[PDB]
Amino acid sequence: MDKLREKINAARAETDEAVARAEAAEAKLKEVELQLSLKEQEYESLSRKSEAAESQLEELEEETKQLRLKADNEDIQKTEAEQLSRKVELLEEELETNDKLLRETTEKMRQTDVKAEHFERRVQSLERERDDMEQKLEEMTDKYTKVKAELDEVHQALEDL
Amino acid sequence: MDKLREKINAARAETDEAVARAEAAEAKLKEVELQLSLKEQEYESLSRKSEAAESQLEELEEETKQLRLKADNEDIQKTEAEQLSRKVELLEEELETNDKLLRETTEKMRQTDVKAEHFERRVQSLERERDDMEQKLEEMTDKYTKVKAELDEVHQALEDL
Amino acid sequence: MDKLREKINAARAETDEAVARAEAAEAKLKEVELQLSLKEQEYESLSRKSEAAESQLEELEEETKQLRLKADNEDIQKTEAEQLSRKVELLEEELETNDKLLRETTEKMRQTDVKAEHFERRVQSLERERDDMEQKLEEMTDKYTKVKAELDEVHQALEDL
Amino acid sequence: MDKLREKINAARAETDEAVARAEAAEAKLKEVELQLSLKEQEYESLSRKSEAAESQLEELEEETKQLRLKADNEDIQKTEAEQLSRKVELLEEELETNDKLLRETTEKMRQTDVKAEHFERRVQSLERERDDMEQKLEEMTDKYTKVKAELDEVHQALEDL
């Protein structure tokens, strides 16, 4: 009849609509499942890359601390070398001054030694001359005493006549 | 009745099967959509983290290079500092030796000056004594000559008797 | 005297004889005349009687002839009467037979009329019942056709499921 | 003498007169005697004739009475025959009328029989048709009940769907 055929058409329409819904939903489900699996694989790859990167970061931080210590030591040594160069210059100036002073003092000592030697040679010559003239004076005094006594005796002799 | 009831049963079963499959597919599609959204969010967060890690890696690598620049020169700088320190110690030893030599030279100069003053005073005394001896010798010689001449004149006069 | 007396005696005797004979003859003549007269009278009377007898004889003879005319026909007339009486009795018997046949025919006609009325009433009742059955059969056939068509339409619609 | 002769003449005259009387009387007597004898013979003949005539009269009277009886019987029979002829005519008329009536009644009975036979044949045909349609109505009623129950069951089945 009319109503029975209409109900049958409605039943077939409901069934076909459900089948179309199922087909579309299954297609979209397949697509999203493939997308989810691919995104999980990408996340795993990126996580392994991040682990490697963090390991490299730790290693680089350790190396950086070591190099910081060594570079600070190098800078300390460089400052020390600069100050030692300046100190070398100062000490060389002081040594030049003191060496000039030492040479001047040595020359003055040599001059004083020459003066002392001159005076000592004068002493020796004066002593020689003094001894010689002292002996000569003794001789002449004896001779004069003798001849004066003789002359007085001769005068006393000629006085009586 | 007969195959009419069989037909309505089979049609109802097919319709219910289609509806159930559609509902299950739609529910699973919603679930996988939600899971994919969450996975995308966490993957984006991990990507941001990995980018930050890479930036830190590059910064640390550049710092490591800049620090190696001085860390490699640490030892050569230490050698240069040791050379300059040895030069400084040599200059200091030379200064101390010069100080000692200057002290010794000054001491010897003072001693020689005292010796020269002593010898000069001795020269003065000896010159005074020598002049005194010479004057006395001249006087004694003159007196001896006078007395001898008088005696000889007397003796000569006696011959003409 | 003598022969005179004889003569007178003889003459007287002859005369007396003649007279006596004459008287006797006359007396006998008178007697025979009277007898003849009486005989004539009685003969005339007898003649009258005989004439009357002859007249009566002729009358009776004529009457006898006239009566014989019918007396001879008596027997033939009786035969004719018997024939007519037999015809009458035959007609009477035919009338009685016709009366009996008419009674029987009327009785049978009444019986047949009653039979015909009975059959006519039976025809009326049977026609009423037949029309009732026909109407009911038409109605039942129409309703069966309607229900069968509806069932077939339903079953046809079920095939297109 | 004169007187004697006169007496003799008178005697002879008397004798002759007596003789003449006797002769005449005897002649007349003979005649009348012959007449009387002849009349007696005639009377005897006529008397015998009269006796014969009276005998014939008696015989004729007896015959006449017999013929009277027979002729009266003949006349009675003739009247009877005439009346029987009239009665024959009357009875023939009555028989003709009654025979016409009998034939009319027989024809009416035949017509009534034809009518009754017509009605009886109608009865038989109507009974045949009634039985046929009654069986057909039973069949159709059963079929309609069955198909109506089936249709109601199908409606109840499709109602639940």
Side-chain angles (χ1 to χ4, degrees):
Chain A
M1 57 174 297
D2 179 9
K3 282 301 179 180
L4 176 61
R5 222 149 301 185
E6 192 75 12
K7 294 173 184 177
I8 295 172
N9 286 16
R12 164 148 61 235
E14 248 181 6
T15 307
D16 285 356
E17 170 178 320
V19 170
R21 290 167 47 197
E23 292 174 338
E26 287 163 6
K28 271 177 281 296
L29 169 64
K30 186 181 187 305
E31 286 193 1
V32 181
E33 283 174 335
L34 189 60
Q35 290 185 242
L36 177 60
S37 65
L38 276 22
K39 205 70 176 182
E40 291 167 346
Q41 284 159 327
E42 290 172 319
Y43 186 89
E44 288 295 325
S45 60
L46 188 56
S47 181
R48 281 128 83 183
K49 185 263 176 183
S50 302
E51 293 195 34
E54 267 97 69
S55 177
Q56 291 177 328
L57 274 171
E58 165 194 352
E59 216 158 351
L60 261 183
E61 281 162 329
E62 173 181 337
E63 178 183 359
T64 300
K65 288 301 111 187
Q66 290 295 300
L67 295 171
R68 276 281 168 80
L69 294 181
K70 271 64 178 182
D72 288 354
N73 297 335
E74 185 267 0
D75 194 71
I76 292 179
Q77 296 299 316
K78 200 177 194 304
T79 304
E80 190 76 14
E82 298 176 354
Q83 301 313 116
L84 285 173
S85 180
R86 306 180 70 184
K87 197 167 188 175
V88 160
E89 209 71 18
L90 283 180
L91 292 184
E92 284 191 357
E93 269 188 321
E94 184 180 3
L95 179 57
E96 170 181 338
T97 299
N98 287 7
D99 186 71
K100 167 62 65 176
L101 183 58
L102 175 60
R103 303 313 171 186
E104 293 177 353
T105 310
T106 305
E107 173 63 24
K108 292 301 180 179
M109 177 184 60
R110 249 68 176 183
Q111 297 179 1
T112 307
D113 203 315
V114 172
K115 185 183 184 64
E117 183 65 28
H118 173 75
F119 278 141
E120 185 171 0
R121 300 170 71 91
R122 293 177 68 177
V123 162
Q124 294 189 346
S125 66
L126 288 171
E127 286 181 331
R128 295 193 301 266
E129 191 172 5
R130 181 211 72 88
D131 276 318
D132 182 64
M133 285 199 305
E134 191 177 26
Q135 287 188 316
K136 294 182 178 180
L137 172 59
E138 275 189 334
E139 282 198 18
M140 291 307 301
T141 300
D142 276 310
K143 295 176 184 177
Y144 166 73
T145 53
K146 178 171 56 183
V147 298
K148 184 67 201 309
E150 295 287 302
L151 181 57
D152 292 355
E153 182 168 329
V154 171
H155 282 349
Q156 298 173 27
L158 59 86
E159 147 218 322
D160 294 310
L161 208 48
Chain B
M1 75 172 192
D2 196 2
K3 298 309 121 182
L4 130 78
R5 178 162 43 251
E6 131 96 67
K7 266 254 185 174
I8 66 176
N9 294 331
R12 153 261 161 192
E14 172 176 323
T15 301
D16 299 359
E17 182 193 34
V19 172
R21 294 208 312 266
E23 291 178 349
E26 293 171 359
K28 221 54 63 185
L29 175 61
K30 262 58 183 178
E31 186 194 14
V32 299
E33 280 188 1
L34 194 64
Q35 293 182 352
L36 176 59
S37 181
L38 302 183
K39 182 62 64 179
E40 289 175 348
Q41 281 187 314
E42 61 193 29
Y43 181 84
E44 197 68 25
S45 63
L46 186 61
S47 304
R48 300 275 201 266
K49 233 180 183 302
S50 63
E51 292 180 353
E54 260 285 328
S55 181
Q56 299 180 43
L57 275 169
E58 310 309 318
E59 221 181 42
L60 269 48
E61 180 179 357
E62 223 65 30
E63 178 181 350
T64 281
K65 152 236 199 300
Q66 298 180 20
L67 290 168
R68 272 263 294 181
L69 289 188
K70 297 164 65 67
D72 298 359
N73 187 77
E74 180 203 356
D75 197 303
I76 294 301
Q77 191 61 72
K78 189 179 305 177
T79 300
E80 180 186 32
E82 291 178 357
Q83 291 179 324
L84 289 167
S85 175
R86 288 187 284 263
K87 188 74 211 72
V88 168
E89 89 188 39
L90 268 23
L91 290 174
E92 293 178 350
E93 251 299 328
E94 296 182 53
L95 278 169
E96 297 174 3
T97 298
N98 175 277
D99 185 19
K100 170 171 174 53
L101 294 182
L102 204 30
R103 304 304 179 88
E104 295 192 29
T105 307
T106 306
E107 166 81 2
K108 234 303 178 180
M109 183 180 63
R110 303 305 182 92
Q111 293 186 358
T112 313
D113 208 2
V114 176
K115 163 197 288 291
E117 287 193 353
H118 176 265
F119 277 145
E120 185 182 25
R121 297 294 150 259
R122 186 52 177 171
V123 161
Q124 176 181 276
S125 60
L126 287 173
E127 280 177 349
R128 195 189 312 106
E129 186 177 11
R130 172 254 275 170
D131 292 356
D132 179 66
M133 292 279 94
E134 189 178 26
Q135 295 293 334
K136 292 177 179 174
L137 177 56
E138 293 178 1
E139 170 181 327
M140 200 56 57
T141 300
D142 293 0
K143 290 196 282 189
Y144 171 80
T145 52
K146 284 183 171 59
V147 179
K148 186 86 168 303
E150 189 166 353
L151 267 176
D152 293 356
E153 234 69 20
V154 169
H155 290 149
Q156 177 196 58
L158 298 169
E159 307 157 351
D160 183 69
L161 246 171
Chain C
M1 75 172 192
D2 196 2
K3 298 309 121 182
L4 130 78
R5 178 162 43 251
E6 131 96 67
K7 266 254 185 174
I8 66 176
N9 294 331
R12 153 261 161 192
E14 172 176 323
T15 301
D16 299 359
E17 182 193 34
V19 172
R21 294 208 312 266
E23 291 178 349
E26 293 171 359
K28 221 54 63 185
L29 175 61
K30 262 58 183 178
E31 186 194 14
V32 299
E33 280 188 1
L34 194 64
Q35 293 182 352
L36 176 59
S37 181
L38 302 183
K39 182 62 64 179
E40 289 175 348
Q41 281 187 314
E42 61 193 29
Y43 181 84
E44 197 68 25
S45 63
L46 186 61
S47 304
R48 300 275 201 266
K49 233 180 183 302
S50 63
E51 292 180 353
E54 260 285 328
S55 181
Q56 299 180 43
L57 275 169
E58 310 309 318
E59 221 181 42
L60 269 48
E61 180 179 357
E62 223 65 30
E63 178 181 350
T64 281
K65 152 236 199 300
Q66 298 180 20
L67 290 168
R68 272 263 294 181
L69 289 188
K70 297 164 65 67
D72 298 359
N73 187 77
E74 180 203 356
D75 197 303
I76 294 301
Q77 191 61 72
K78 189 179 305 177
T79 300
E80 180 186 32
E82 291 178 357
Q83 291 179 324
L84 289 167
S85 175
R86 288 187 284 263
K87 188 74 211 72
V88 168
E89 89 188 39
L90 268 23
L91 290 174
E92 293 178 350
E93 251 299 328
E94 296 182 53
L95 278 169
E96 297 174 3
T97 298
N98 175 277
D99 185 19
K100 170 171 174 53
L101 294 182
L102 204 30
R103 304 304 179 88
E104 295 192 29
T105 307
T106 306
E107 166 81 2
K108 234 303 178 180
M109 183 180 63
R110 303 305 182 92
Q111 293 186 358
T112 313
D113 208 2
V114 176
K115 163 197 288 291
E117 287 193 353
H118 176 265
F119 277 145
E120 185 182 25
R121 297 294 150 259
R122 186 52 177 171
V123 161
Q124 176 181 276
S125 60
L126 287 173
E127 280 177 349
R128 195 189 312 106
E129 186 177 11
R130 172 254 275 170
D131 292 356
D132 179 66
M133 292 279 94
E134 189 178 26
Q135 295 293 334
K136 292 177 179 174
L137 177 56
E138 293 178 1
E139 170 181 327
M140 200 56 57
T141 300
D142 293 0
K143 290 196 282 189
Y144 171 80
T145 52
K146 284 183 171 59
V147 179
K148 186 86 168 303
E150 189 166 353
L151 267 176
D152 293 356
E153 234 69 20
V154 169
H155 290 149
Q156 177 196 58
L158 298 169
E159 307 157 351
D160 183 69
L161 246 171
Chain D
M1 57 174 297
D2 179 9
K3 282 301 179 180
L4 176 61
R5 222 149 301 185
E6 192 75 12
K7 294 173 184 177
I8 295 172
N9 286 16
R12 164 148 61 235
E14 248 181 6
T15 307
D16 285 356
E17 170 178 320
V19 170
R21 290 167 47 197
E23 292 174 338
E26 287 163 6
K28 271 177 281 296
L29 169 64
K30 186 181 187 305
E31 286 193 1
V32 181
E33 283 174 335
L34 189 60
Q35 290 185 242
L36 177 60
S37 65
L38 276 22
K39 205 70 176 182
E40 291 167 346
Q41 284 159 327
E42 290 172 319
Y43 186 89
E44 288 295 325
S45 60
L46 188 56
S47 181
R48 281 128 83 183
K49 185 263 176 183
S50 302
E51 293 195 34
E54 267 97 69
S55 177
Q56 291 177 328
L57 274 171
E58 165 194 352
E59 216 158 351
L60 261 183
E61 281 162 329
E62 173 181 337
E63 178 183 359
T64 300
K65 288 301 111 187
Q66 290 295 300
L67 295 171
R68 276 281 168 80
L69 294 181
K70 271 64 178 182
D72 288 354
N73 297 335
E74 185 267 0
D75 194 71
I76 292 179
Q77 296 299 316
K78 200 177 194 304
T79 304
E80 190 76 14
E82 298 176 354
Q83 301 313 116
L84 285 173
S85 180
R86 306 180 70 184
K87 197 167 188 175
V88 160
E89 209 71 18
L90 283 180
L91 292 184
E92 284 191 357
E93 269 188 321
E94 184 180 3
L95 179 57
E96 170 181 338
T97 299
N98 287 7
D99 186 71
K100 167 62 65 176
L101 183 58
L102 175 60
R103 303 313 171 186
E104 293 177 353
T105 310
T106 305
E107 173 63 24
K108 292 301 180 179
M109 177 184 60
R110 249 68 176 183
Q111 297 179 1
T112 307
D113 203 315
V114 172
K115 185 183 184 64
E117 183 65 28
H118 173 75
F119 278 141
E120 185 171 0
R121 300 170 71 91
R122 293 177 68 177
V123 162
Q124 294 189 346
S125 66
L126 288 171
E127 286 181 331
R128 295 193 301 266
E129 191 172 5
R130 181 211 72 88
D131 276 318
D132 182 64
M133 285 199 305
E134 191 177 26
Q135 287 188 316
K136 294 182 178 180
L137 172 59
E138 275 189 334
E139 282 198 18
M140 291 307 301
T141 300
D142 276 310
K143 295 176 184 177
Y144 166 73
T145 53
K146 178 171 56 183
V147 298
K148 184 67 201 309
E150 295 287 302
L151 181 57
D152 292 355
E153 182 168 329
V154 171
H155 282 349
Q156 298 173 27
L158 59 86
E159 147 218 322
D160 294 310
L161 208 48

